[PDB]
Structure formats: C-alpha cells, structure tokens
C-alpha cells in the first residue's frame, strides 16, 4: 500500500477550495447572511418605512456638523546631510486612472532644487530653505488622487495628505534617512508659512482519523457555523467534491469523510469549445450562435423546518454534442440543418456492381454496357411497383438518349426491350414508342 495514493487522491480537492477560500473571502459570490439555515446571522430585521423627503434634512443638518475645519503656505530648511553635492526634491502629483487608462496617472513636477553640502556634519554650519506656494488647488479635488514629496541626491519620498484630505505633516525638526538606487541620513526642519473528530476513508484499505480544533468553523473555508445542523448543511453543499456522514460520537461530533465518486463537474458552456484546436478555445471575443435550450430549477419551495433526523430540474432542447455519422467529428450548429447525410445511392455500391458485372466472361460489350447503364438508373430512383415500368424505360432513354446514340448501341437496347416484354412488364404499345422518342 503506497500511501501516496491516499495522499495524492485527497491532495487534489484540497488546494482548490483553499484558493477558493481566499478568493471568496475577498470575492463574495453571495452574501451568506441571506442564506436560510444561516438565519442566526443577519441579526437585523426588515421593519422600517424611512420616507425619503426627510433623508435630506438629516443630512442637511449632519453636513453642518460634518464640516469640521480646513487648513490655510510652507517653508522649511534642510539641515545638512549626514553619511557614514546638490539635492533633488520633487512634487509628484497623482490623479485618478480613467477608462482608457490602464494605471494611475502620476505627474512629477519639481518645485526646485538647491546645493546641499557634500555629506556635511554638525558644528560646521554658520542652509537651503524650501518655500512652497499653494501649488495644490481645490479644483484638484476631482482629478488628482494624491500628492507626495520626493528627495534625491540616492532616493527618498514622503506624501503630504491623507485620503480624508488630512495633512500628515506638522512643523518641526526631523531626522530622516535615505537609500541609494545608521548609514546615510539627513535632518531638517519644517514650518507652515463539544469535541469534534474526523475519519478519512480510503475504501477501507486504509484510513486516517483526526479531531476538529476550534470546531464549528469550517476546516476549509473557516465559515462560522453555530450549529451542527447548519455546519452539516454548508459542508454537504459547498465543499461538495467529497462525501460525509454524521456519526455522533458521544464526545459531541464525529464525521467520517470520503471522496465523492462521480461529482459530474465538466465544462458548462457552448459544449463545442471543448474541441476547438487550442488557442481558439475560450476565445470570448466574438459572438457565436448555438442551439436553443431552456431549463427550470426553482419552481416552488417547501419551506420546512429544521430536522436533525434528516441528517444521517428538467430539460428542453438539445443538450449534447452531435457527431458526423461517418468520421466521428463534431457537428457545427449550422451543419446540423436539413443536411441528413443519407440517401438511397451509396457511391461504393455503384462501383461494386459494375466491377462485379465485369467478372462475367460469356458476354459481349454490347450487353455489359447496356446492363450497367440501366441498373445504375434503376438504383437512382428505386422502382418497385410494376405500374412504374412503362414510365421507367421512358425516362431511361429520356436521360441516356445522347449516350446510346453516341454509343450506337440502340439495337441491343431493343433486344432488352424484348426481354422485358417477355417478362410481362412492357406492352407492345410502347416498345416501338421508345425507338420513336429516341430520334
């Protein structure tokens, strides 16, 4: 028993839900508090009227309160740099990304530069002041996202505001470091101027058992179910690629899990894409036509109540991929039209019969040619009723007039007419009539 089997098997379903866990945690598929059996969630009710013509006044007053205050230039000197050359300071302006824009727009405008000493030190001074106007404007409250401050000689950066248009920069002497492309640093000032258990079955060849820690939280999606009922539900529905069973060990709960057997998970889209030569499948970049279908799933619910004892959809249209009768290839939704790839005359048959005729030795070409030219037309229309035979020979020469003439074979045609009358299907009243219509 190479237990890697038990491993490899149960390996697969895990990572999937694992990824799905995070995804859903940020990518909700549906608000859980709406769920029926998760009714303990959504503690609030739906009891309120809340007329609207008053919603404004509550905000009309609230905005008087919400308007706290605002800030009303700047000037700051750079204490000499320190390290164990002119400086470069910029004003970068960030705006909101737009429709055609793939990333946020940033505008790095320089307010100016100065000449800092070459990594100076203390007690040597006896000085470049940076003064800023109101470069930022209140109109920018619709276009720019944020403003930051850049510093190079060698890189450094700071930002000016908060998302609430809240300045983050008071006035004072500050000591900061910087990086290139402890150690180098610069100073400056600023101024504004029941225990639960599991058991993992492997078709009884082996198994493994564990115990739930921090129970009533999903061992995969960490969903907080507050009842064995709701937990059992969420498990036997969401993490469906397995199967479960309720054992009720005396210690409070035990669930011996097993893998699903079928779990019919296969692509549910245009059933044709599955076979598009790769690179084109899942194109998702051009409308495509397909056959119409209609399903029904939720018609009228029961709305029963909880019952732990319990714990222990039709079609209309074509729902598959049809194939060509003779090559086993897919069938486009248009090719499945009136074309029915079937009729009375199979090519290979026409060939086979002529060939078989040619086996005969005791015949003249003035006979074989005739027999073939006739039997083929026989096949072509499928004559059965004896009352047809008159019209038959008629149409026969009606088609093969030019040929038998070009064959100069009409005389044996007449011999055939003789034979056929002999077999009681022609009247003399037409035999001649043939040679008549012939010319």
């Amino acid at each position: 028993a190479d237990h890697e089997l038990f491993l490899q098997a149960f390996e697969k379903p895990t990572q999937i839900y694992r990824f799905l866990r995070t995804r859903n945690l940020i990518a909700p598929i549906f608000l859980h508090r709406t769920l029926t059996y998760m009714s303990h969630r959504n503690s609030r009710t739906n009891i309120k009227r809340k007329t609207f013509k008053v919603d404004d006044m509550l905000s009309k007053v609230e905005k008087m309160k919400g308007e706290q205050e605002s800030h009303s230039h700047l000037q700051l000197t750079f204490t000499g740099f320190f390290h164990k050359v002119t400086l470069e300071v910029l004003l970068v302006k960030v705006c909101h990304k737009k429709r055609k824009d793939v990333s946020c727009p940033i505008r790095q405008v320089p307010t100016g530069k100065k000449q800092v000493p070459l990594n100076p030190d203390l007690n040597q001074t006896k000085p470049s002041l940076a003064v800023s106007s109101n470069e930022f404007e209140p109109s920018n409250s619709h276009m720019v996202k944020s403003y930051s401050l850049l510093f190079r000689v060698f890189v450094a950066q700071m930002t000016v505001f908060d998302k609430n248009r809240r300045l983050q920069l008071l006035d004072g002497e500050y000591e900061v470091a910087m990086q290139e492309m402890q150690g180098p640093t610069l100073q400056f000032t600023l101024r504004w101027t029941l225990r639960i258990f599991y058991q993992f079955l492997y078709n009884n060849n082996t198994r493994q058992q564990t115990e739930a820690r921090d129970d009533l939280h999903c061992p995969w999606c960490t969903l907080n179910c507050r009842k064995l009922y709701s937990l059992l539900k969420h498990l036997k529905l969401c993490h469906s690629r397995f199967i479960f069973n309720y054992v009720y060990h005396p210690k409070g709960a035990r669930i011996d899990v097993s893998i699903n057997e079928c779990y019919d998970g296969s692509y549910a889209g245009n059933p044709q894409d599955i076979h598009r030569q790769p690179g084109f499948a899942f194109s998702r970049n051009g409308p495509v036509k397909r056959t119409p279908i209609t399903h029904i799933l939720v018609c009228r619910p029961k709305r029963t109540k909880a019952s732990m004892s319990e714990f222990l959809t039709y079609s209309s249209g074509h729902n598959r991929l049809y194939f060509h009768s003779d090559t086993c290839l897919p069938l486009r939704p248009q090719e499945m039209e009136v074309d029915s790839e079937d009729e009375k005359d199979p090519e290979w048959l026409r060939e086979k019969t002529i060939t078989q005729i040619e086996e005969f030795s005791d015949v003249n070409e003035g006979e074989k040619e005739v027999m073939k030219l006739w039997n083929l037309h026989v096949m072509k229309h499928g004559f059965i009723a004896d009352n047809q035979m008159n019209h038959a020979c008629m149409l026969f020469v009606e088609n093969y007039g030019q040929k038998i003439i070009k064959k100069n074979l009409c005389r044996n045609f007449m011999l055939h007419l003789v034979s056929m009358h002999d077999f009681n299907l022609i009247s003399i009243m037409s035999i001649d009539k043939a040679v008549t219509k012939l010319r």
Binding site: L20, K63, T294, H295, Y314, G317
Partner: protein, 395 residues
C-alpha cells in the same frame, strides 16, 4: 506570454464557482429560469401588458429583445414567457412542452444598440443602430415571418446624428417627445407626435451640446414633461430643463463621480431622488433641491457599472449591474445599521442582495410590471435568466 496562461486559469475557476452556485441555489431563490438564445442580445424591456389565462397556474408576458449577431441577418425580436402565477402549483410546474416561445421577428439592418417601447404606445418602439440615425417600428404592421429578402420598411427613421449612440427616452407626459444621445457630443430631439408626411425622414427638433465628451446616457423627468439631465464621459451631469432655449448652457452642471458616468435613473415614488452610475465602481445619488452633496456611496462593485433601475412596487429598492459578472441589490433603509461582526464580515448592512447567476459580463437587466419581485438578466453568452429571490429576505 503570461496573460494567456492566466486567463485559462481564471476561466477554469469561474467554471468551478458557477458549479457551486448552481448546487447551492435551491435554498436561495423563489424562481429559477434559464434559457439560451442562438445569438446574444443587448436590450431588455418588459412589455407593460399582461394576460393571465384561467384554469391554470401561470401568467403570460412579452419581452422586448434585441440582437447582435456575428455577420448574418439581424433581427428585432419579441418573445413569450409563461411565468407561474400560483402559490400551490409546482412536468416541471405547468405544461410539459414549452414555457418560452418566440413570436415576433423583424428584419434589421445592423445590430441593435438600444430598444425601448413608447410609454404612450407600446406598439411604438425606438431603435439605436450602428448607423448615425434612429429607427422606429410598429410590429403590428409587419408579419412575424421575416422578409427572406432582408431590409424592409424602416417605419419613419430619423435624422440629426453623425455617430452612433445609446441614449433613448420618450417623454412620459408628452407624446412624440424623445431624446437621443450619441458620440456626436450632442442630444437630438425629434417629435413624432404628429408626422403625417413620414417619408422616413424627420430631423431632430432641437440639438443640445453642453458636454465636450462622448455622451453616455439621458433620461427624461418622471413627473415633469420639461425636465431631464445628461451624462457623458466628462464626469459632468448637466441638468437640462427645456423651454429655456439654450442648447449650450444647461440649467445646472456639476461633477458627479471621479470616473466617467455611465447610467442614470430617477426614483418614481419621490420627486427629487436621482440615482447615478459611473465607471468609478461607485454609486451616488442626488436631489433636485440641492446638488452640492454626494449623498451616499455604495462601494462593492469590482468593475464598471453600466445600468441602474429603481423598483416598481417598491419605493426603497434599487439595482446595480456592471461587468463583474455580478448583480447587486441595495437598501436605502439600512444605511449604517449596527450589525454583528459576522453580519459585517458578510457585508455592510444597506447592501441587500447579490445575484450569482451569470458567468460573463452582465449585459442588461430589467424589472417588470405585473409581478412584484422578479428581474430578467441578459449576458453576452447567449444567456437569458429569470428568477425570483427567496421571500424571507424581506420581512
């Protein structure tokens, strides 16, 4: 490259997620109706009329659908649906043969970019086309069996635009009054309330130009016959009260969102409540009295937003659709309601519901009359879904 690998992965993931949502549906809705069309659509409109045959358990409704095929003949379509109108009935629920059927086909030149029926006459509808004009039709004047030849009676097309567009709105009070909005940065207005000499040529009565960006949407007032706003990618909403005679300077104009505005809608039951929708993945709203106040923001969509629609039969219920393959349902009453940490990790309170059916960019949706709480949705995957949420959620 990378994007290809990544997209393959994303596709497989979406497939899994839809599998799960399907497995989970029964405890979630009061109706599930799915149907596949041969060619997708870009339109949605419930006909305001309903018939309910007796001795049965179901109603009957008619829907207004468009068509954007690949290359072949285009068509305007309206089909039939048998909604269960019953509480005790449940082959499936009613007859065994069919619940949906096409009934109306009309030849069409170019795809359909927009289609709405006239409020005064449902037999009158409009049509936005890949061209730079407008088409109007009355189905009762054409057979359902389509002209095998092709193009047919345009039924009084219009004139006055130079690039295509998507805006479309009759005036509810005034017949014939209809607004348009196209890439021309202009709003063109015809009045077909009386055109005896049709000639298939009517020019727009008035042409407004106040946006300097490609306009996106326009909607009349709901009570006033002389009031309507404007939407372009300027992120500027402009208020256009007519009878003031200035196609250049509107009555009002402000910035709505930081991204381009897409969809716009007014509350029916109120007088002042506006519902706005933009590319900002945001949802704002305003009032006719004062405007310098973004009243609120719904912030859960994860991509652009293309449609907003208030609820009939419900004063405080709205709907937000976009591209994220999701669909939201909000609540104006639960604005900032203290909820449990698990209720909060579920989501903010005022957000009411989220639809989980489609698996592509949700093209369009619609409420309906004649039925309290149901909405049909159309994606780009030839997919039409109709549903009814479970009842317990409200009350």
């Amino acid at each position: 490259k990378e994007a290809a690998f990544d997209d393959a992965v994303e596709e497989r993931v979406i497939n899994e997620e839809y599998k799960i949502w399907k497995k989970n549906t029964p405890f979630l809705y009061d109706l599930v109706m799915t149907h596949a069309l041969e060619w997708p659509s870009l339109t949605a409109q419930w006909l305001p009329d309903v018939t309910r045959p007796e001795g049965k358990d179901f109603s009957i409704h008619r829907l207004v659908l468009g068509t954007h095929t690949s290359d072949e003949q285009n068509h305007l379509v309206i089909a039939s649906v048998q909604l269960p109108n019953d509480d005790a009935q449940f082959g499936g629920f009613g007859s065994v043969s069919g619940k949906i059927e096409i009934e109306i086909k009309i030849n069409h030149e170019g795809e359909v970019n927009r289609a709405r029926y006239m409020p005064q006459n449902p037999c009158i509808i409009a049509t936005k086309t890949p061209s730079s004009d407008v088409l109007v039709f009355d189905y009762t004047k054409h057979p359902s069996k389509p002209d095998p030849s092709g193009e047919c009676n345009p039924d009084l097309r219009l004139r006055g635009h130079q690039k295509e567009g998507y805006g479309l709105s009759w005036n509810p009070n005034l017949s014939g009054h209809l607004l348009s909005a196209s890439d021309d940065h202009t709003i063109c207005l015809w009045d077909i309330s009386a055109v005896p000499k049709e000639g298939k040529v009517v020019d727009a009565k008035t042409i407004f130009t106040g946006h300097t960006a490609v306009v996106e949407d326009v909607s009349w007032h709901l009570l006033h016959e002389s009031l309507f706003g404007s939407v372009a990618d300027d992120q500027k909403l402009m208020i256009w009260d007519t009878r003031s005679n200035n196609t250049s300077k509107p009555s009002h104009s402000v910035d709505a969102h930081t991204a381009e505005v897409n969809c716009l809608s007014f509350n029916p039951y109120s007088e002042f409540i506006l519902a706005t929708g933009s590319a900002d993945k945001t949802v704002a709203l305003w009032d006719l009295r004062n405007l310098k106040l973004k009243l609120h923001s719904f912030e859960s969509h994860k991509d652009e937003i293309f449609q907003v629609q208030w609820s009939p039969h419900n004063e405080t219920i709205l709907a937000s659709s976009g591209t994220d393959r999701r669909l939201n349902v909000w609540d104006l009453s639960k604005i900032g309601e203290e909820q449990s940490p698990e209720d909060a990790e579920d989501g903010p309170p005022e957000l009411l519901f989220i639809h989980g059916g489609h698996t592509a960019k949700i093209s369009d949706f619609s409420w309906n009359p004649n039925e309290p709480w149901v909405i049909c949705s159309v994606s780009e995957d030839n997919i039409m879904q109709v549903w009814q949420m479970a009842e317990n959620i409200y009350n």
